[PDB]
Amino acid sequence: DKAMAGNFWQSSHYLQWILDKQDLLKERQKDLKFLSEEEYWKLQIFFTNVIQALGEHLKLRQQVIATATVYFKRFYARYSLKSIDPVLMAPTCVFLASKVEEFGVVSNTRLIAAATSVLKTRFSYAFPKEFPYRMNHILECEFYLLELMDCCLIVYHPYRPLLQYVQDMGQEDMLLPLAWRIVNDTYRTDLCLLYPPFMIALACLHVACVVQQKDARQWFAELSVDMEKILEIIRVILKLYEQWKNFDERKEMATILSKMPKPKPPP
Amino acid sequence: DDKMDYDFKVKLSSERERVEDLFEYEGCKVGRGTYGHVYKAKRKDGKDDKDYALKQIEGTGISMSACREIALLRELKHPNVISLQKVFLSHADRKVWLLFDYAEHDLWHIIKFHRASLPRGMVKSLLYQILDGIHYLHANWVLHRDLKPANILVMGEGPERGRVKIADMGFARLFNSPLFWYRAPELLLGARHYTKAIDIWAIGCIFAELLTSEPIFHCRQEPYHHDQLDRIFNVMGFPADKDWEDIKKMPEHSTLMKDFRRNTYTNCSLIKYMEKHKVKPDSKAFHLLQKLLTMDPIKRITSEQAMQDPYFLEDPLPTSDVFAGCQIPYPKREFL
């Protein structure tokens, strides 16, 4: 079993990195001078897809890609998109998360090749120019990222608890593939900064049951948990899929990226 | 960076606590190893006159080893495990510094002072806290992997007087892979992974050393280490088939068979070893020790079961302060 598996309630994730929605949206108003609310969520979707693409290329596990995705969200929760280019932060987040695991090492040349390849082949609609950063830029970014997160590296995700619930129902064949992908889809939203992982997993599993038309009400009733907060999580998930419908990442992202505030140069 | 926002860069630069400003340590080097170098430090401001341990982690940036130590220590909280107070990230030279509460003593120096010639209240209390601290780690699926007297710190004068502090955990091992006085026989026969049991064996060795003042499996300088195995058998005897059925599953079992004979160690057992060092084999201490020093790791008791042992219910009780309110005769650490 993984390090600190049963420690969520005493963890740094829970004690420091479950943020208030009021505090989140107030710090976001910095970037809302340039981008709209709609454009801000669209950017978050884009960069979630970029971090997934990088992870898939480096052949990292979904849980490492998640940790990387959260590191990214934590950074831009506090700071503006102007502060560090999110094209540099994304692979730096993947790089730091991979090192938190003691199984396998992602190398320097292989990080730069992965960033370069992924932007060129999978995101050329957004980025005309080649990936411009080199390893010195990643290593500098790593330090700023680590500082902001207050060295909180261990991150809990909905996958572990999801797995326990589907095994509890005895419906791993029917529901796990779908519930799992919905958990991946939740990383397109702020849910991981706002709720504990297990509540997100429950919400995902409910949407899975409704989509696949299995009656899970008697199982859900038998859970000791705030159902209001779960319903809140289902609404974001339901909304996410209508955002997905109405959004053409490929037709809109170049322009939205131009609207992002640029950094100030040195004097 | 020429493409990081400047206001952001100078702001963080303005506010960043630098280790050289907060702490006085130059020339107070207290330990050196292949995992970063440790210093006895005091604060430059007069906010508190306590001592801190500053560790500068070897190499630039965040290595896997750096990462994982930071990652875990940032989560772990238990009185018998060393506490990360603060992480300094020095941007100019790219060095990382970890700040800890300073432990004045350790079991290596304590034992060596006694060998240069331990009360039983103290031995039991040391063992109990070691077990308490490892049990915490183990419940959180964190192994130590390098347990030994020098890695069992003990706090001195101050509000944590005489509390054990487990330190220097092997946080990075590539794929959890081991691929020698405190190493369990399975590692010596080529065990491919670290386990809870391997740590426990190590604790048994430390307990035997606490009772006798002598490393139980002391051996000269040499995966498979013949002479260290020879010493294990001189003390323990050679294991019967019945004692360790899975020994045949070990990668080095065929080497063991070529190199060693059962009848070499017919006189040898843990009972006879401990009798030489003035410890009774019908004492609760011995029966506990024997359970920790079980050759088959699946027959080794766990840290939780060790804490439940009736040895800790026998007069005298373990005490929070390992020194039991008595004056500490052990000398303060020498600088390196």
User: Which CATH number applies to B103-336?
Assistant: 1.10.510.10
User: Which CATH number applies to B1-102?
Assistant: 3.30.200.20
Strand-pair category, B164-166 with B37-43? unpaired
Backbone torsions φ then ψ of A82, nearest 5 degrees: -70, -20
Catalytic entry in B101, B132, B146, B168: B146
Contact B141 A5 (CB under 8 A): yes
Nearest C-alpha of chain B: how many angstroms from A52? 22
What residue spans define the domains of chain B? Answer: 1-102, 103-336
Contact B303, B200 (CB under 8 A): yes
A 116-155: CB under 8 A from B: 137, 139-144, 146-147, 151-154
The count of residues in chain A is 267
Measured between alpha carbons, how far is residue A38 from residues A41, A72, A244, A252, B265 in Å?
Answer: 5, 19, 12, 12, 78
> Quick one: which of A155, A163, A162 has its CA closest to A192?
A155
Supply the Cα-derived Rg of chain B in whole angstroms. 22
Placement of tokens 């915490």 in the chain: B136
Which pair of tokens denotes residue A150?
């207050």
**B87 pairs with which residues across the strands?**
B98
Q: Is the Cβ of A80 closer than 8 Å to some Cβ of chain B?
A: yes
Contact B52, B23 (CB under 8 A): yes
- Say yes or no: A30 and A146 in one domain: yes
- Say yes or no: A96 and A203 in one domain: no
Question: Any idea what the CATH number is for the domain that residue A176 is in?
Answer: 1.10.472.10
Residue type, B287: H
Measured CA to CA, the distance from residue B70 to residue B92 in angstroms comes to 20
Classify each residue of B23-45 as buried b or exposed e, where b means 16 or more C-beta atoms within 10 Å of its C-beta: bebeebebbeeebbebbbbbeee
CB pairs under 8 A between A and B: 109
Domain of residue A192, residue span: 1-22+155-267
* Residue from B140, B144, B175 whose CB has the most chain A CBs within 10 Å, to mutate: B140
User: Is B30 labelled as part of a ligand binding site?
Assistant: yes
Which method, experimentally, gave rise to this model?
A: X-ray
Backbone torsions φ then ψ of B96, nearest 5 degrees: -110, 135
Measured CA to CA, the distance from residue B313 to residue B20 in angstroms comes to 48
Question: Coil, helix or strand for B138?
Answer: helix
Strand-pair category, B37-43 with B105-106? unpaired
Q: Cis peptide before B316, with omega less than 30 degrees from 0? A: yes
- Say yes or no: A228 and A267 in one domain: yes
Measured CA to CA, the distance from residue B270 to residue B293 in angstroms comes to 9
Which pair of tokens denotes residue A51?
């971090």
Placement of tokens 């952001």 in the chain: B8
Nearest C-alpha of chain A: how many angstroms from B175? 4
Backbone torsions φ then ψ of B101, nearest 5 degrees: -65, 135
State which of A122, A154, A186 marks the end of a domain: A154
Measured CA to CA, the distance from residue B102 to residue B99 in angstroms comes to 9
Q: Which residues of B touch A79 (CB under 8 A)?
A: 8
DSSP A195: S
- Say yes or no: A133 and A222 in one domain: no
Other beta carbons within 10 Å of A197: 24
**B90 pairs with which residues across the strands?**
B95
Question: Coil, helix or strand for A132?
Answer: coil
**B166 pairs with which residues across the strands?**
B81, B152
Q: Which residues of B touch A2 (CB under 8 A)?
A: 141
Measured CA to CA, the distance from residue A242 to residue A256 in angstroms comes to 19
State which of A121, A154, A187 marks the end of a domain: A154
Q: Which residues of A touch B87 (CB under 8 A)?
A: 151
Measured CA to CA, the distance from residue A119 to residue B119 in angstroms comes to 67
Please tell me the total count of domains within chain A. 2
Task: Give one word for A129, left, alpha or beta, with left for phi > 0 and alpha for psi -120 to 50.
Answer: beta
Contact B140 A3 (CB under 8 A): yes
Contact B35, B168 (CB under 8 A): yes
Active-site residue, B146 included: yes
- Say yes or no: A118 and A192 in one domain: no
State which of A90, A125, A154 marks the end of a domain: A154
- Say yes or no: A38 and A110 in one domain: yes
Q: Is the Cβ of A27 closer than 8 Å to some Cβ of chain B?
A: no
Placement of tokens 């079961």 in the chain: B305
Other beta carbons within 10 Å of B200: 26
Contact B5, A263 (CB under 8 A): yes
Q: Which residues of B touch A80 (CB under 8 A)?
A: 5, 8
